[PDB]
Amino acid sequence: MSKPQPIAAANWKSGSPDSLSELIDLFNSTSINHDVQCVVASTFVHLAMTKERLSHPKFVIAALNAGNADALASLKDFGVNWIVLGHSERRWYYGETNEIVADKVAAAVASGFMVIACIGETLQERESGRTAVVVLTQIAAIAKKLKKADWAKVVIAYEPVWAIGTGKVATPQQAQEAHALIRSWVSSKIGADVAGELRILYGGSVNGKNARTLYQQRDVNGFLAGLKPEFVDIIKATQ
Structure with missing residues (x-):
């Protein structure tokens, strides 16, 4: 096994407690054959339900x-040890700076959390060839606030804004190129050991049909997607 352990993370930003309860029952009943860390991430208002209902040994809860x-x-103090920081989206909608996310990552790591940090470029950045500079600027800001040993607690997600909620998924070649660019920077600036163990997840219009072909790429270690029935197939795709 060359790749590190995969992650499949489902995000529940909104929706009925009753429809969530049903999805959690589905997940609790699902047998998963392989080594994967599954994550259900939600906003605060939904965390008490998720923490109460979710019981599968391969799942953990995260805060969005x-x-x-x-x-x-x-x-x-409630037993939640993972956080998802949606930086690529917050940079677009709110102008969140790279330094603000980097400080959030370091604060969470210092408090004992595992952190999924989402990085990525805008539509116009992609169109103009700015992807590599923009993505590398984001990872470098994060790295500035971490020590080498802290990377065991970090997961990076490549989440280009143009793919979020648009139905326009990155092609396998696009995801691979971005993920390789990140990994090679980590290898060069942090270390090859860290780079090899780092999980780099893809997010943005992932579904039950496109996930498997994405996972077959060398530098893709899993997914961020919505919390929907098809997430069962997104987990299977990480085999």
Whole structure:
């Protein structure tokens, strides 16, 4: 096994507690044959339901864009040990700076969390050839605030804004190129050991039909997707 352990993360940003409860029952009943870490991420308002209902041994709960020190402490005291930082989306919609996400990553790691940090370019950046510079600027800001040993707690997700909620998935070649670019930068600037163990996940219009062909790429280690019945097939795709 050359790739590190894959991750499949489902995000529940909104929706009925009753429809969530049903999806969690589906997941709790699903046998998963291979080594994969599955994650159900949700906003605070849905965490108490998820924590109460989810019981599968291959699943953990994560908080979506958790907030400040008080919020991290409230998560830790409730038993939630993963956070998802949706930086590529927040950079587009809100102008969140790269330095703000980097400080959030370091604060979460310092508080004992595993952190999925989502990085990625805009539509216009992609169109104009700015992808590599933009992505590398994001990973370098994150790295600035971490020590080498801290990378064991970090997962990077490549989430280009143009693929988020648009139905326009990155092609296998596009995902691979971006993921390789990130990994090679980590190898060069942090270390080859860290680069080899780093999980780089793809997010943005992943579904049950396109996930498997994405996973077959050398530098793809899993997925961020929505919490939907097809997520069962997204997990299978990480075999």
